[PDB]
Every structure is written in C-alpha cells, then in structure tokens.
Design an enzyme around this catalytic site. Structure first.
Site, mmCIF file in Angstrom:
data_model
loop_
_atom_site.group_PDB
_atom_site.id
_atom_site.type_symbol
_atom_site.label_atom_id
_atom_site.label_comp_id
_atom_site.label_asym_id
_atom_site.label_seq_id
_atom_site.Cartn_x
_atom_site.Cartn_y
_atom_site.Cartn_z
ATOM 1 N N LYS B 17 -10.682 -15.063 10.616
ATOM 2 C CA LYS B 17 -11.338 -16.322 10.992
ATOM 3 C C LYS B 17 -12.815 -16.211 11.353
ATOM 4 O O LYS B 17 -13.661 -16.837 10.704
ATOM 5 C CB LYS B 17 -10.561 -17.045 12.122
ATOM 6 C CG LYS B 17 -9.121 -17.484 11.726
ATOM 7 C CD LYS B 17 -8.326 -18.235 12.806
ATOM 8 C CE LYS B 17 -8.081 -17.399 14.038
ATOM 9 N NZ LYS B 17 -9.234 -17.507 14.972
ATOM 10 N N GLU B 31 -16.792 -16.747 19.451
ATOM 11 C CA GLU B 31 -15.734 -16.354 20.360
ATOM 12 C C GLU B 31 -16.450 -15.835 21.601
ATOM 13 O O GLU B 31 -17.363 -15.046 21.483
ATOM 14 C CB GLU B 31 -14.916 -15.253 19.697
ATOM 15 C CG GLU B 31 -13.618 -14.964 20.375
ATOM 16 C CD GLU B 31 -12.557 -14.515 19.408
ATOM 17 O OE1 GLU B 31 -12.552 -13.306 19.120
ATOM 18 O OE2 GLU B 31 -11.753 -15.377 18.952
ATOM 19 N N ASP B 104 -15.158 -21.425 17.318
ATOM 20 C CA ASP B 104 -14.236 -20.346 17.081
ATOM 21 C C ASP B 104 -13.128 -20.608 18.090
ATOM 22 O O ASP B 104 -13.241 -20.224 19.250
ATOM 23 C CB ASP B 104 -14.884 -19.011 17.365
ATOM 24 C CG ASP B 104 -14.026 -17.864 16.925
ATOM 25 O OD1 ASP B 104 -12.784 -17.956 17.007
ATOM 26 O OD2 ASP B 104 -14.593 -16.860 16.477
ATOM 27 N N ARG B 105 -12.075 -21.274 17.619
ATOM 28 C CA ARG B 105 -10.897 -21.673 18.403
ATOM 29 C C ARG B 105 -11.043 -22.938 19.304
ATOM 30 O O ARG B 105 -12.164 -23.298 19.754
ATOM 31 C CB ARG B 105 -10.319 -20.481 19.179
ATOM 32 C CG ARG B 105 -9.943 -19.298 18.293
ATOM 33 C CD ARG B 105 -9.654 -18.058 19.110
ATOM 34 N NE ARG B 105 -8.235 -17.759 19.097
ATOM 35 C CZ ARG B 105 -7.632 -16.943 18.236
ATOM 36 N NH1 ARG B 105 -8.304 -16.300 17.307
ATOM 37 N NH2 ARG B 105 -6.322 -16.849 18.240
ATOM 38 N N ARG B 162 -9.359 -5.535 12.104
ATOM 39 C CA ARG B 162 -10.100 -5.866 13.313
ATOM 40 C C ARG B 162 -9.375 -6.361 14.562
ATOM 41 O O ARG B 162 -9.003 -7.539 14.728
ATOM 42 C CB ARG B 162 -11.399 -6.663 13.029
ATOM 43 C CG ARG B 162 -12.721 -6.015 13.635
ATOM 44 C CD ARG B 162 -12.507 -4.509 13.980
ATOM 45 N NE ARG B 162 -13.708 -3.674 13.892
ATOM 46 C CZ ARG B 162 -13.698 -2.336 13.885
ATOM 47 N NH1 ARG B 162 -12.545 -1.661 13.958
ATOM 48 N NH2 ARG B 162 -14.848 -1.667 13.806
ATOM 49 N N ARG B 164 -9.851 -6.452 18.721
ATOM 50 C CA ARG B 164 -10.914 -6.572 19.718
ATOM 51 C C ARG B 164 -10.826 -5.391 20.704
ATOM 52 O O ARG B 164 -9.794 -4.720 20.787
ATOM 53 C CB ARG B 164 -10.747 -7.890 20.481
ATOM 54 C CG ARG B 164 -10.704 -9.136 19.611
ATOM 55 C CD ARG B 164 -11.907 -9.178 18.712
ATOM 56 N NE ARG B 164 -12.124 -10.473 18.067
ATOM 57 C CZ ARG B 164 -11.301 -11.038 17.188
ATOM 58 N NH1 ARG B 164 -10.161 -10.442 16.854
ATOM 59 N NH2 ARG B 164 -11.692 -12.127 16.533
ATOM 60 N N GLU B 167 -7.386 -4.268 22.514
ATOM 61 C CA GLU B 167 -6.173 -4.680 21.816
ATOM 62 C C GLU B 167 -5.277 -3.503 21.475
ATOM 63 O O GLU B 167 -5.763 -2.375 21.294
ATOM 64 C CB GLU B 167 -6.534 -5.262 20.463
ATOM 65 C CG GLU B 167 -6.920 -6.678 20.434
ATOM 66 C CD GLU B 167 -6.621 -7.283 19.085
ATOM 67 O OE1 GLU B 167 -5.539 -6.971 18.524
ATOM 68 O OE2 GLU B 167 -7.458 -8.072 18.591
#
Ligand SMILES: Cc1cn([C@H]2C[C@H](O)[C@@H](CO)O2)c(=O)[nH]c1=O
Ligand SMILES: Cc1cn([C@H]2C[C@H](O)[C@@H](CO)O2)c(=O)[nH]c1=O
Lengths: 304, 300
Positions: B17, B31, B104-105, B162, B164, B167
């Site tokens: 995204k 983000e 972004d979201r 990917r 973050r 994660e």
C-alpha cells in the site's frame, strides 16, 4: 416541536453527586446512572478495584510507571465505554438549541472518563500525557445544549466525605482526590477562558467572571517535556489535540453547584440551576420515547 | 467553495500500500511511523508483536496481553483520530477537485480493524474492541476507502519483503487481519443492501450472510447475558458500527500486479470516488498545510 433538557452532573467523586441527582428526579425526567455494572462485571471485572490497586502498587514501587499506564489507559477505556456509546446513540436525536418534554439527568459526561480522570491519573504518574491527548482526540463532538453541572465542596469537607463515599475496590487516596479536584477546577476555568475569547496558541507562551489565565486552565497540564520538540514547541500532533479540546469545551454550558449543604439543599440548589439551562429540540417527534427508553434501558442494565 | 477528494488507502499490511500510493493538487498523509516509534510511545509496533509473541509462548496471560494490546492501539490510532478531528470542520457536503488527499489508512484501521484482528488472536477483549468502535468518529461526507485484493501466498511473499521496525512475521496475524478486512468489505455491502443486524442476528444462532459480516465476531460469550442475549450496551455499539460503516464508499484495488500498475489502478478508481465541498475559502490551503505538516513530523 418537543424540546429536551439534558444535564450532566460531573465533578470529583465523593461530593454527593449521585444522591442529589436521584433526589432531583424523585420530583418526563429520567436519570442515567453511573454504569457500575459495566465497571464491575460487563466490560471487565472490578475495574474500580483495578484502578486504585494499580496506583497503590505503583505508589509502593511494586510496578513501574509503564505498567501502571498500560493498565490505567486500558481501565479508562472500560470506564468510559457506556458514556461514549450512549452519546453516539443519542446524537442523531439531538436537534437545535431551543417546559421540557423530557429532562435527562446524567451521572457524569463522556469527558469524565475521556479527559478528567485520565488527566488526573497523568498527574498521579500512572498515565502518559500522550495517552491523555489520545483520549482527548476521541472526545465526541459536543452536542447542542450540553449543560454541565460541576460540584464545589471545601477540601476538608470533601476529605471527610471521601472517607465515607468509597466504592467497592476504592482506596482512600488524598493525592488523587487533590489531582481530580484540581483537574475539574481547571476544567471549569478552561470553559470560561474559551468562552471569554481565550486562544491557547496565542497565550501558550504565558505558561462567570473575567477571562482566566491560561496557566489556570487545562492547557497548562500539557507543558510536559514528552510533548515538546527539540525546538521547545509542542509537536503539532499534540497541538492539534489541544485544538480539539478547545473545540469540544467551548460549546458546553457549565454550571457550578455547591455541595457544602444538605442533600435536599443540593437538590433544590440544582433544581434552581436547571432553569437557566439550554434545552434543544429533538430530531423526530418520536425521539422523546426513544430517548426515554434508552435512558431506562441504560439504567436497568448498568445502574448499580 | 472549492472541492476536495479524500482517499484513504487501507487494508492489511504487507500488500504494498504505502509503496504504490507514493508512486502517485494532491497531498499524501503518510503512515505516522515517528509517532509510533518515538512521539507517543517508544517502538509501539515492536511492543505489539512482542506481546503477542509472549502470549503465544505462554510467557504472559491473555489479560496481560489485552491490557498492553489495548493501550498500544490507542497510541497507534492517535494520529488518525486528531487528523480526522481537525479535518472534520472543513468538510462540507458531497458533490476536477481543488485538492486530493491520499491518506495512508483510515481511523477505523486502529479503532476497529486491528483491535478486531487482535481479539481474533486472543490478545484483546471484545469489550475493548467495542469501546473503540463506540469511539469511531462520525463518518464525514466523501469518505472513500480503498481496500486491497491479494492472494494469501503472494501476500505472505510481500509481507516478508516489508516488515516495519519491530514486526515479527506472524502468519496467524496475517490471517486474522485479512479475515477482518474481508468481513469489513462484506459488512459495508451488507449495510448498503439494507441489512439489519438486529433483524439478522438470529441466523448466527441480494446480500452477504450476516455470518460473513463483522457482526459475527461479536456473538462472543463475554458480550452475552446468561440467557444468550447480547447486552444492550454492546448492541448499541453495534448500532454505531452499522451507522459509521454504511456511509463509507469502498473501492477494491487488486495488488497482485506491479507498483506502477497498482498505481495506475488506484488513480483509476478515482473516477467513482465521492468529492465534497470544503467549508471555507481557506479550507484547501489549511487542509494542505495539515497534510504537509503531518507528513513532515510523523512520516519517518
Ligand atoms: C468516571 C470515572 C470514575 N472513576 C472512579 C471515581 C470513583 O472512584 C469511582 C466512581 O466514580 O471510580 C475513575 O477512576 N475513572 C473514571 O473515568
Ligand atoms: C494501523 C495499525 C497497524 N498495525 C501494524 C501493522 C503493521 O505491522 C504496521 C504498519 O501497518 O503496524 C497495528 O498493529 N495496529 C494498527 O492499528
């Protein structure tokens, strides 16, 4: 069209707020109690006990500030849940500001759980100022005719009552009584400040009646190093949250009630404050019974 | 007053995204990684993945994880919530646009979707999930949400590409999260085709079956009275959910393609998105500065 009168009685616990509102209703008028059953059972188990124990553990050094915060923030979300759903479900029925066809007497407003207790807990070191501002960013849009009655009561008188009016799981914490008393004091000032023309951004550097000094409003709590950029200013995220806070409180109609009197005294005193209060119309003729039934269901399910 | 097109690219993480939106009179509200990692708390994303991990390994209990998970989701959605709060007053009624905002979201990612996925992972109480729902801000006009389409194994490949900072590849969270966004898309269609959850609730005991909507997650034992009845508090939070979601405009982007193609497809969905008017002359520049300041301060 039919009108509605909404009155939220708020303020520090231990002043006799729940008694006098019931007294008031004992006289087309409905009470929306504190949702104790939600706090003790439905949302989580013994949330009030969880809150006072955490602080105590923290105060005792048994847990860290990071552990208290994680627990407090979470507990605060539970505490405010019934306030938030009720507000959101009620919103579409509230019409424009206009005897009332229905009077709803609430025990606390959403800001108690979304702003006041979090701000007080932040002062107590069991919540971060960033989490408080997160809550503030989520305070629901202020509906027309939002009348808030805040309570006044000398501290010594409050301390004695506090020893009295404890909750199951509640612990006598005077440091917290002082923090919450202070937070609500700042709240009343902030409303006056905002209504007197105050702009926090214009006065940031300086950190009824005449306009209060920004340092005597809630804005002053957010002068924390955590929210400050290397350049000394508030990060914009936090600044934007203060903008929402000012936006939410500026339309509220705040009244102060003296609790330093008998229960029937507070009732009649509140009965008298209630006239200079803003009513509003409802969005549908049948909003009244609907609203009436929401309040009654809330009461019946979460009151205790 | 001039017009604005707001577009929130949302859906599970690991689909590409952020990458495809960057490839796009148009501002991009990125983000808020700096807020997550530094500003609101230290390494929120790491905190999340680590707690689930300790839960999974039995190092902590479900209740400990829930407290951490709940507390963190508050930190994760803060930037979305204030942005929405500060933006709301400029959004006028629904109607080329004077400004196009690519987010972004959307707030629902942190106030509904991730919390729901975490409940599905045993690390968030459904009461907590409904508390966030109850707090979802009213849905402003012209709220266009782009959700993504991508086959699981292809998504796993991308997820791997990917992650973050902090994660942990968690295929069970990929599954919980893809489940949630799938139900979400189903719920919007459900609500738009006239679906009434109160009326369809018993079936859990042309439109999607309520069993294929977000409502099915809340047939959770913690939310029910001894006789199986959903407590009213929770039923009212379902009313808010229904109210918030129904007015959204959902668009699906097939991510199973190249970044420029993904980019092309996205710009393509634009023709059917709803624009709105701004409230003041000066709304556009103000909105522009917010989006740019947000980017500048919170995008890492
Ligand atoms: C509304 C509210 C009350 N309380 C405390 C005050 C009293 O101790 C008790 C009941 O109001 O719970 C909180 O700690 N947080 C809240 O958000
Ligand atoms: C938006 C959001 C993302 N996340 C995770 C997904 C990815 O790991 C990273 C970026 O989307 O953050 C959460 O855990 N919670 C949230 O609310």
């Amino acid at each position: 069209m039919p009108t509605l009168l909404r009155v939220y009685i708020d303020g520090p616990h231990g002043m006799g707020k729940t008694t006098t509102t019931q007294l008031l209703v004992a006289l087309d008028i409905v009470y929306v109690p504190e949702p104790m059953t939600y706090w003790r059972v439905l949302g989580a188990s013994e949330t009030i006990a969880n809150i006072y124990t955490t602080q105590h553990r923290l105060d005792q050094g048994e847990i860290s500030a990071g552990d208290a915060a994680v627990v407090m923030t979470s507990a605060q979300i539970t505490m405010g849940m019934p306030y938030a759903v009720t507000d959101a479900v009620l919103a579409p029925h509230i019409g424009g500001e206009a005897p009332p066809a229905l009077t709803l007497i609430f025990d606390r407003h959403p800001i108690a759980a979304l702003l006041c207790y979090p701000a007080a807990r932040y002062l107590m070191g069991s919540m971060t100022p960033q989490a408080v501002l997160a809550f503030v960013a989520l305070i629901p849009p202020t509906l027309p005719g939002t009348n808030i009655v805040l309570g006044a009561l000398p501290e010594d008188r409050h301390i004695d009552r506090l020893a009295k009016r404890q909750r199951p799981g509640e612990r006598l914490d005077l440091a917290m009584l002082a923090a919450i008393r202070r937070v609500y004091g700042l709240l009343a000032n902030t409303v006056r400040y905002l209504q007197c023309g105050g702009s926090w951004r214009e006065d940031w550097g300086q950190l009824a009646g005449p306009r209060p000094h920004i340092g005597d409003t809630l804005f002053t709590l957010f002068r924390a190093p955590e929210l400050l950029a290397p350049n000394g200013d508030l990060y914009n995220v936090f600044a934007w949250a203060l903008d929402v806070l000012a936006k939410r409180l500026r339309s509220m109609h705040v009244f102060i009630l003296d609790y330093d009197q008998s229960p029937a005294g507070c009732r009649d005193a509140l009965l008298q404050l209630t006239s200079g209060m803003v009513q509003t119309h409802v969005t549908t003729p049948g909003s009244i019974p609907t609203i009436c039934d929401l309040a009654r269901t809330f009461a019946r399910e979460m009151g205790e």
